[PDB]
Amino acid sequence: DGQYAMTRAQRVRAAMFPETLIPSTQFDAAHPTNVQRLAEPSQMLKHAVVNLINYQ
Protein backbone atom coordinates (compact mmCIF):
# COMPACT_ATOMS: atom_id res chain seq x y z
CA ASP A 1 0.00 0.00 0.00
CA GLY A 2 1.66 3.16 1.27
CA GLN A 3 1.64 6.44 -0.65
CA TYR A 4 0.74 4.64 -3.88
CA ALA A 5 -2.51 3.22 -2.49
CA MET A 6 -3.55 6.43 -0.75
CA THR A 7 -3.16 8.38 -3.99
CA ARG A 8 -4.65 5.73 -6.28
CA ALA A 9 -8.00 7.52 -6.29
CA GLN A 10 -6.57 10.81 -7.54
CA ARG A 11 -4.59 9.13 -10.33
CA VAL A 12 -7.64 7.30 -11.67
CA ARG A 13 -9.78 10.40 -11.11
CA ALA A 14 -7.26 12.45 -13.10
CA ALA A 15 -7.33 10.11 -16.08
CA MET A 16 -11.09 9.63 -16.37
CA PHE A 17 -12.40 12.81 -14.74
CA PRO A 18 -9.61 15.36 -15.27
CA GLU A 19 -12.11 18.24 -15.16
CA THR A 20 -12.92 17.34 -11.55
CA LEU A 21 -9.50 18.61 -10.47
CA ILE A 22 0.17 13.38 -7.33
CA PRO A 23 2.93 10.69 -7.42
CA SER A 24 3.78 9.11 -10.78
CA THR A 25 4.17 5.39 -11.38
CA GLN A 26 6.03 5.62 -14.68
CA PHE A 27 9.19 3.48 -14.83
CA ASP A 28 10.77 5.22 -17.80
CA ALA A 29 9.78 8.21 -19.91
CA ALA A 30 9.61 6.12 -23.08
CA HIS A 31 6.79 3.97 -21.67
CA PRO A 32 3.46 5.57 -20.69
CA THR A 33 1.54 3.85 -17.88
CA ASN A 34 -1.63 1.77 -18.22
CA VAL A 35 -3.63 4.66 -16.79
CA GLN A 36 -1.99 7.13 -19.17
CA ARG A 37 -2.66 4.84 -22.14
CA LEU A 38 -6.28 4.29 -21.08
CA ALA A 39 -7.05 7.91 -20.10
CA GLU A 40 -8.09 9.24 -23.51
CA PRO A 41 -10.16 6.26 -24.71
CA SER A 42 -11.78 6.38 -21.25
CA GLN A 43 -12.72 10.05 -21.59
CA MET A 44 -14.07 9.63 -25.11
CA LEU A 45 -16.35 6.85 -23.93
CA LYS A 46 -17.79 9.01 -21.15
CA HIS A 47 -18.29 11.92 -23.55
CA ALA A 48 -20.08 9.60 -25.93
CA VAL A 49 -22.33 8.32 -23.14
CA VAL A 50 -23.18 11.82 -21.91
CA ASN A 51 -24.24 12.91 -25.40
CA LEU A 52 -26.40 9.82 -25.83
CA ILE A 53 -28.02 9.91 -22.38
CA ASN A 54 -28.82 13.61 -22.86
CA TYR A 55 -30.50 13.26 -26.26
CA GLN A 56 -33.55 15.47 -26.81
Binding site: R8, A15, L45, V49
Partner: protein, 230 residues
Protein backbone atom coordinates in the same frame (compact mmCIF):
# COMPACT_ATOMS: atom_id res chain seq x y z
CA UNK B 1 -6.37 -9.63 -1.32
CA UNK B 2 -7.34 -7.12 -4.02
CA UNK B 3 -9.55 -4.52 -2.33
CA UNK B 4 -10.52 -2.24 -5.24
CA UNK B 5 -13.77 -1.53 -3.39
CA UNK B 6 -12.53 1.42 -1.35
CA UNK B 7 -11.22 3.30 -4.41
CA UNK B 8 -14.29 2.34 -6.44
CA UNK B 9 -16.43 3.99 -3.73
CA UNK B 10 -14.55 7.29 -3.88
CA UNK B 11 -15.02 7.62 -7.64
CA UNK B 12 -18.63 6.45 -7.63
CA UNK B 13 -19.86 10.01 -6.95
CA UNK B 14 -18.12 11.08 -10.17
CA UNK B 15 -19.62 8.25 -12.22
CA UNK B 16 -23.08 8.99 -10.84
CA UNK B 17 -22.76 12.76 -11.38
CA UNK B 18 -21.97 12.36 -15.06
CA UNK B 19 -24.70 9.76 -15.67
CA UNK B 20 -27.27 12.19 -14.29
CA UNK B 21 -29.85 13.34 -16.84
CA UNK B 22 -29.14 17.08 -16.98
CA UNK B 23 -40.86 7.29 -33.94
CA UNK B 24 -37.31 6.18 -34.69
CA UNK B 25 -34.66 8.88 -34.29
CA UNK B 26 -31.80 8.86 -36.79
CA UNK B 27 -29.77 11.42 -34.85
CA UNK B 28 -30.08 9.23 -31.76
CA UNK B 29 -28.77 6.15 -33.58
CA UNK B 30 -25.55 7.92 -34.57
CA UNK B 31 -24.99 8.90 -30.92
CA UNK B 32 -25.66 5.24 -30.12
CA UNK B 33 -23.12 4.23 -32.77
CA UNK B 34 -20.58 6.70 -31.37
CA UNK B 35 -20.87 5.06 -27.95
CA UNK B 36 -20.49 1.62 -29.50
CA UNK B 37 -17.40 2.83 -31.36
CA UNK B 38 -16.00 4.42 -28.20
CA UNK B 39 -16.72 1.12 -26.44
CA UNK B 40 -14.82 -0.89 -29.05
CA UNK B 41 -11.88 1.54 -29.01
CA UNK B 42 -11.62 1.36 -25.22
CA UNK B 43 -11.94 -2.42 -25.36
CA UNK B 44 -9.03 -2.55 -27.81
CA UNK B 45 -6.65 -0.67 -25.48
CA UNK B 46 -7.69 -2.68 -22.43
CA UNK B 47 -7.05 -5.98 -24.18
CA UNK B 48 -3.64 -4.71 -25.28
CA UNK B 49 -2.79 -3.50 -21.78
CA UNK B 50 -4.02 -6.66 -20.05
CA UNK B 51 -1.85 -8.68 -22.44
CA UNK B 52 1.42 -6.78 -22.02
CA UNK B 53 0.98 -6.42 -18.26
CA UNK B 54 3.35 -8.59 -16.23
CA UNK B 55 1.15 -8.32 -13.15
CA UNK B 56 -2.52 -9.11 -12.44
CA UNK B 57 -2.98 -10.66 -15.90
CA UNK B 58 -5.91 -12.90 -14.95
CA UNK B 59 -7.50 -10.16 -12.87
CA UNK B 60 -7.07 -7.53 -15.62
CA UNK B 61 -8.48 -9.86 -18.27
CA UNK B 62 -11.52 -10.46 -16.06
CA UNK B 63 -11.82 -6.69 -15.76
CA UNK B 64 -11.95 -6.28 -19.54
CA UNK B 65 -14.49 -9.10 -19.88
CA UNK B 66 -16.67 -7.29 -17.36
CA UNK B 67 -16.30 -4.04 -19.35
CA UNK B 68 -17.24 -5.87 -22.56
CA UNK B 69 -20.32 -7.45 -20.98
CA UNK B 70 -21.47 -4.08 -19.66
CA UNK B 71 -20.77 -2.66 -23.10
CA UNK B 72 -23.11 -5.13 -24.78
CA UNK B 73 -25.85 -4.44 -22.23
CA UNK B 74 -25.36 -0.73 -22.92
CA UNK B 75 -25.37 -1.40 -26.66
CA UNK B 76 -28.66 -3.29 -26.52
CA UNK B 77 -30.29 -0.72 -24.24
CA UNK B 78 -29.18 2.23 -26.37
CA UNK B 79 -30.45 0.55 -29.52
CA UNK B 80 -33.89 -0.03 -27.97
CA UNK B 81 -33.96 3.58 -26.78
CA UNK B 82 -32.98 5.07 -30.14
CA UNK B 83 -35.87 3.16 -31.70
CA UNK B 84 -38.21 5.38 -29.65
CA UNK B 85 -36.64 8.19 -27.56
CA UNK B 86 -40.03 9.08 -26.05
CA UNK B 87 -40.11 6.26 -23.50
CA UNK B 88 -38.84 6.96 -19.99
CA UNK B 89 -38.49 3.26 -19.23
CA UNK B 90 -36.01 2.59 -22.04
CA UNK B 91 -34.34 5.91 -21.27
CA UNK B 92 -33.84 4.73 -17.70
CA UNK B 93 -32.73 1.24 -18.70
CA UNK B 94 -30.05 2.87 -20.86
CA UNK B 95 -28.93 5.33 -18.18
CA UNK B 96 -28.56 2.52 -15.66
CA UNK B 97 -26.68 0.42 -18.23
CA UNK B 98 -24.39 3.39 -18.84
CA UNK B 99 -23.68 3.88 -15.14
CA UNK B 100 -22.82 0.20 -14.91
CA UNK B 101 -20.54 0.43 -17.94
CA UNK B 102 -18.52 3.37 -16.63
CA UNK B 103 -18.23 1.69 -13.25
CA UNK B 104 -16.68 -1.34 -14.93
CA UNK B 105 -14.35 1.03 -16.78
CA UNK B 106 -13.47 2.74 -13.51
CA UNK B 107 -12.68 -0.59 -11.88
CA UNK B 108 -10.45 -1.52 -14.81
CA UNK B 109 -8.44 1.68 -14.40
CA UNK B 110 -8.04 0.95 -10.68
CA UNK B 111 -6.59 -2.49 -11.45
CA UNK B 112 -4.42 -1.07 -14.23
CA UNK B 113 -3.00 1.45 -11.76
CA UNK B 114 -2.29 -1.34 -9.26
CA UNK B 115 -0.20 -2.99 -11.95
CA UNK B 116 1.55 0.29 -12.81
CA UNK B 117 2.76 0.29 -9.22
CA UNK B 118 3.93 -3.31 -9.32
CA UNK B 119 5.77 -2.69 -12.58
CA UNK B 120 7.38 0.29 -10.87
CA UNK B 121 8.49 -1.62 -7.78
CA UNK B 122 9.87 -4.47 -9.90
CA UNK B 123 12.91 -2.29 -10.65
CA UNK B 124 14.08 -2.99 -7.11
CA UNK B 125 13.98 -6.73 -7.73
CA UNK B 126 15.56 -6.40 -11.17
CA UNK B 127 18.49 -4.48 -9.68
CA UNK B 128 18.71 -6.89 -6.74
CA UNK B 129 18.76 -9.82 -9.16
CA UNK B 130 21.41 -7.98 -11.18
CA UNK B 131 23.65 -7.82 -8.12
CA UNK B 132 23.10 -11.54 -7.51
CA UNK B 133 24.74 -12.14 -10.89
CA UNK B 134 27.66 -9.93 -9.84
CA UNK B 135 27.93 -11.93 -6.61
CA UNK B 136 27.74 -15.34 -8.31
CA UNK B 137 30.10 -14.66 -11.22
CA UNK B 138 35.94 -15.67 -13.76
CA UNK B 139 37.00 -12.02 -13.98
CA UNK B 140 35.32 -11.67 -17.38
CA UNK B 141 31.85 -12.29 -15.94
CA UNK B 142 32.27 -9.75 -13.13
CA UNK B 143 33.03 -6.90 -15.52
CA UNK B 144 30.05 -8.00 -17.62
CA UNK B 145 27.63 -8.54 -14.73
CA UNK B 146 28.57 -5.08 -13.48
CA UNK B 147 27.70 -3.65 -16.90
CA UNK B 148 24.19 -5.11 -16.69
CA UNK B 149 23.75 -3.73 -13.17
CA UNK B 150 24.73 -0.16 -14.04
CA UNK B 151 22.27 -0.23 -16.94
CA UNK B 152 19.43 -1.45 -14.75
CA UNK B 153 20.57 0.93 -12.02
CA UNK B 154 20.34 3.93 -14.35
CA UNK B 155 16.80 2.86 -15.19
CA UNK B 156 16.25 2.63 -11.42
CA UNK B 157 17.90 6.02 -10.87
CA UNK B 158 15.14 7.59 -12.98
CA UNK B 159 12.32 6.22 -10.82
CA UNK B 160 14.05 6.86 -7.50
CA UNK B 161 14.91 10.43 -8.53
CA UNK B 162 11.29 11.19 -9.45
CA UNK B 163 10.17 9.67 -6.16
CA UNK B 164 12.68 11.58 -4.05
CA UNK B 165 11.55 14.90 -5.55
CA UNK B 166 7.91 13.98 -4.87
CA UNK B 167 8.64 13.56 -1.16
CA UNK B 168 7.13 16.34 0.94
CA UNK B 169 8.56 15.47 4.36
CA UNK B 170 12.20 16.66 4.57
CA UNK B 171 13.15 13.79 6.89
CA UNK B 172 11.86 11.35 4.27
CA UNK B 173 13.87 13.07 1.54
CA UNK B 174 17.05 12.29 3.46
CA UNK B 175 16.10 8.64 3.96
CA UNK B 176 15.66 8.18 0.21
CA UNK B 177 19.03 9.72 -0.65
CA UNK B 178 20.60 7.65 2.13
CA UNK B 179 19.31 4.25 1.04
CA UNK B 180 19.92 5.08 -2.62
CA UNK B 181 23.38 6.24 -1.58
CA UNK B 182 23.91 3.07 0.45
CA UNK B 183 23.07 0.79 -2.48
CA UNK B 184 25.50 2.74 -4.67
CA UNK B 185 28.55 2.20 -2.46
CA UNK B 186 27.86 -1.40 -1.45
CA UNK B 187 27.32 -2.34 -5.10
CA UNK B 188 30.94 -1.38 -5.75
CA UNK B 189 32.01 -3.08 -2.52
CA UNK B 190 30.23 -6.11 -3.95
CA UNK B 191 32.38 -5.92 -7.08
CA UNK B 192 35.54 -5.63 -4.98
CA UNK B 193 34.37 -8.50 -2.77
CA UNK B 194 33.39 -10.73 -5.69
CA UNK B 195 36.78 -9.99 -7.22
CA UNK B 196 38.54 -10.92 -3.98
CA UNK B 197 36.78 -14.29 -4.02
CA UNK B 198 37.89 -15.24 -7.54
CA UNK B 199 41.53 -14.66 -6.65
CA UNK B 200 41.16 -16.49 -3.34
CA UNK B 201 38.46 -19.21 -3.64
CA UNK B 202 39.87 -21.18 -0.69
CA UNK B 203 39.85 -18.30 1.81
CA UNK B 204 36.63 -18.67 3.79
CA UNK B 205 36.59 -14.99 4.76
CA UNK B 206 36.46 -13.92 1.10
CA UNK B 207 33.21 -15.85 0.70
CA UNK B 208 32.03 -14.57 4.09
CA UNK B 209 32.58 -10.92 3.14
CA UNK B 210 30.92 -11.33 -0.24
CA UNK B 211 27.81 -12.83 1.36
CA UNK B 212 27.86 -10.05 3.96
CA UNK B 213 28.25 -7.22 1.44
CA UNK B 214 25.34 -8.67 -0.53
CA UNK B 215 23.21 -8.55 2.61
CA UNK B 216 24.16 -4.86 2.79
CA UNK B 217 22.84 -4.56 -0.77
CA UNK B 218 19.54 -6.08 0.37
CA UNK B 219 19.12 -3.55 3.19
CA UNK B 220 19.42 -0.58 0.83
CA UNK B 221 17.06 -2.03 -1.79
CA UNK B 222 14.54 -2.53 1.02
CA UNK B 223 15.30 0.93 2.39
CA UNK B 224 14.72 2.47 -1.03
CA UNK B 225 11.43 0.57 -1.19
CA UNK B 226 10.27 1.57 2.31
CA UNK B 227 11.03 5.23 1.60
CA UNK B 228 8.97 4.91 -1.58
CA UNK B 229 5.88 3.14 -0.20
CA UNK B 230 5.50 5.65 2.65
Amino acid sequence: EIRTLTVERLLEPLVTQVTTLVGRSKKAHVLAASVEQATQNFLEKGEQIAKESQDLKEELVAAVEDVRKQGETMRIASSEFADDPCSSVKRGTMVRAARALLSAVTRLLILADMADVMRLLSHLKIVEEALEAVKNANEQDLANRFKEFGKEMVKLNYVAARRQQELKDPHCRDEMAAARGALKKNATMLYTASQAFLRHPDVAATRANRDYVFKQVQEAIAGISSAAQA
